Design a protein around this ligand. Structure first.
Ligand code: 402
Ligand code: SF4
Ligand code: SF4
Ligand code: SF4
Ligand code: SF4
Ligand code: FES
Ligand SMILES: [Mg+2]
Length: 574
């Protein structure tokens, strides 16, 4: 093929789109609705417009290159077309970036500035009530910002295959939303928030818990515990221009103390708790062989998927609570026993890469004696805004350390945030439990990586067993519908709703579509977690000394008695 772009001749054999070929050759072409190898098929944004000699204006994102093409990307005809489309977008857009939560990383704003477009008439609603949906515990919609780009719809379809996010004909006007414009919570939605990640503007956002946290911090009698997820320490640095794959664990601990938190713990401690219970349960299910297979239950996105599509698998779920909820339960019981705090004055706050964790925290039965396991959940993004509002120089902060009582963790807990992390951590303890030994080779590299479905054979005391790792909600559908589950007898199965694991959660920092082409965000975020595992002295959950102390002095032996009564949760089918 011979291609002419802006006067420059190219010789190539590649078969691809005009957009992709120009990006690879350092030729600038703007785009808006093109994402995840998809554009808005029904109403294309046409921001990727180029001029092909002899044909006219075309969309570069979905037009293949042909030999003999002469292409102009910057002609006056092209720029006025693009500028016209942006101006029409401005006509339906509340353009007040001041108090906007995407102000410093909005894609639409960069386009408005680049082409210097203005609205035919500013869109200024008097009552945003009709435009805003805040009914969900996890997700919120602001349709005064929505560009109808369809990127959230496509992301939902690709990541989950549920299509819980749809286009809707509302009063004869097109919107996006849940089925029959119901609250997302009341549909087959998983609340994974992958739609939010895909959104170029502030139309989709997480349900804010920042007022819960601030009211608690200022309440004199409240003792506010904070604990962050594995993934947060490996990603929040992005929002402070520190780059990708930067471990900022110690900086976060310092920042949380300066925010006014009374106690600094860590969810990885809770991760070690979940392994103690789940590995014991797996070893138990082997003594009786069954019921097989055992599924993990630490991902609420997956739990909802099971409830909504495969309720017969609910009885196969591990009864152990998620690290978030199991940590919260201990924070209202064990922690007062070693602090003398009144349990009702304890207020437990987690930092999560996940929107679905808000729903899990607000489950009705996720409490005991009137005390919630978790009282508030804030996302990575929420923590970042909170730090900036306090004007805390995050990048310059010195490393501090979490409080030891529920802040220590092993390398097994550390890797929870990556896909296959839970599988590997559980095998390290369950294999030591059943064989009654302390094995030294603890790395399970087969269950790692970004493959959608991963499988391995393991030998646990005398015998062979089959494990599988499901990476992404759409892959769960494939595993089940294709009958892969019935090809052999599986004994232990890990399921994560977000592809890549929690490091790619719905509450994570946004990334510019082109930076995504430079950086593999899923592996770069996960590398930090495996790094910590490598350089940690303790790499098994049952070697966690602060955790062993807790079980010996308070809970007893994991998997039965006291431990089973309050550190476990069961899901019932209607
Ligand atoms: N609870 C919990 Fe988990 C833990 O530990 C997080 O905190 Fe995850 C992360 N990062 C999230 O959200 S949930 C799914 N299990 C793997 S990691
Ligand atoms: S979505 Fe972007 S362009 Fe619209 S108000 Fe917010 S920052 Fe400004
Ligand atoms: S909610 Fe966001 S991603 Fe979805 S159509 Fe509107 S602007 Fe696009
Ligand atoms: S939260 Fe997840 S399942 Fe629900 S609409 Fe968004 S992407 Fe789809
Ligand atoms: S994979 Fe992690 S971030 Fe995604 S829904 Fe599940 S728990 Fe939340
Ligand atoms: S980016 Fe090509 S039509 Fe939208
Ligand atoms: Mg206070």
């Amino acid at each position: 093929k011979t291609i002419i772009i802006n006067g420059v001749q190219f010789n190539t054999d590649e078969d691809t789109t005009i957009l992709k070929f120009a990006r690879d050759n350092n030729i600038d072409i703007s785009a808006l609705c093109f994402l995840n190898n998809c554009n808005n098929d029904i109403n294309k944004c046409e921001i990727c417009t180029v001029e092909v000699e002899g044909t006219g204006l075309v969309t570069a994102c979905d037009t293949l290159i042909e030999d003999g093409m002469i292409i102009n990307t910057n002609s006056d005809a092209v720029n006025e077309k693009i500028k016209s489309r942006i101006s029409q977008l401005l006509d339906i857009h509340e353009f007040k970036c001041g108090p906007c939560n995407r102000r410093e990383n909005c894609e639409f704003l960069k386009l408005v500035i680049k082409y210097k477009a203005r609205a035919s008439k500013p869109f200024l609603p008097k009552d945003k009530t009709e435009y805003v949906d805040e009914r969900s515990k996890s997700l919120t919609v602001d349709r005064t910002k929505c560009l109808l780009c369809g990127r959230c719809v496509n992301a939902c379809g690709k990541n989950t295959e549920t299509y819980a996010m749809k286009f809707l004909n509302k009063n004869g006007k097109t919107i996006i939303g849940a089925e029959d414009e119901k609250c997302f919570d009341d549909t087959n939605c998983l609340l994974c928030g992958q739609c939010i990640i895909a959104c170029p503007v502030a139309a989709l956002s997480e349900k804010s818990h920042m007022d819960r946290v601030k009211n608690a911090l200022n309440a004199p009698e409240k003792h506010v515990i904070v604990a962050m997820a594995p993934s947060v320490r490996a990603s929040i640095g992005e929002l402070f221009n520190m780059g990708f794959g930067v471990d900022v664990t110690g900086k976060i601990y310092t920042a949380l103390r300066q925010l006014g938190f009374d106690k600094i713990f860590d969810i990885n401690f809770g991760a070690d708790m979940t392994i103690m219970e789940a590995a014991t349960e797996l070893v138990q299910r082997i003594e009786n062989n069954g019921p097989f297979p055992m599924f993990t239950s630490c991902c609420p996105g997956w739990v909802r998927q099971a409830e909504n599509y495969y309720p017969e698998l609910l009885n196969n779920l591990s009864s152990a609570k998620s690290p978030q909820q199991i940590f919260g339960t201990a924070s209202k019981t064990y922690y007062p026993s070693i602090s003398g705090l009144d349990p009702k004055n304890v207020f437990t706050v987690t930092v999560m890469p996940c929107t679905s964790k808000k729903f899990e925290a607000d489950r009705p039965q996720m409490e005991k004696d009137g005390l919630r396991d978790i009282d508030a959940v804030i996302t990575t993004r929420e923590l970042a805004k909170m730090i900036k509002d306090a004007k805390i120089p995050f990048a310059k902060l010195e490393d501090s350390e979490a409080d030891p009582a529920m802040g220590e963790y092993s390398g097994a807990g550390a890797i929870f945030g990556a896909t296959g992390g839970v599988m590997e951590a559980a095998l390290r303890s369950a294999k030591d439990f059943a064989e009654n030994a302390e094995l030294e080779d603890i790395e399970y590299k087969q269950v790692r990586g970004l493959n959608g479905i991963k499988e391995a054979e393991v030998e646990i005391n005398n015998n062979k067993y089959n494990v599988a790792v499901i990476n992404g909600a759409s892959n769960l559908f494939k595993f089940m519908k294709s009958g892969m589950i019935n090809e052999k007898q599986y004994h232990f199965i890990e399921v994560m709703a977000c592809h890549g694991g929690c490091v790619n959660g719905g509450g994570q920092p946004h990334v510019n579509p082109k930076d995504l082409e430079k950086v593999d965000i899923k592996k770069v975020r996960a590398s930090v977690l495996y790094n910590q595992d490598e350089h940690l002295s303790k790499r098994k959950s049952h070697e966690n000394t602060a955790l062993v102390k807790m079980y010996q002095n308070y809970f007893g032996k994991p998997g039965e008695g006291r431990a089973h009564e309050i550190l476990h949760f069961k899901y019932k089918k209607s």
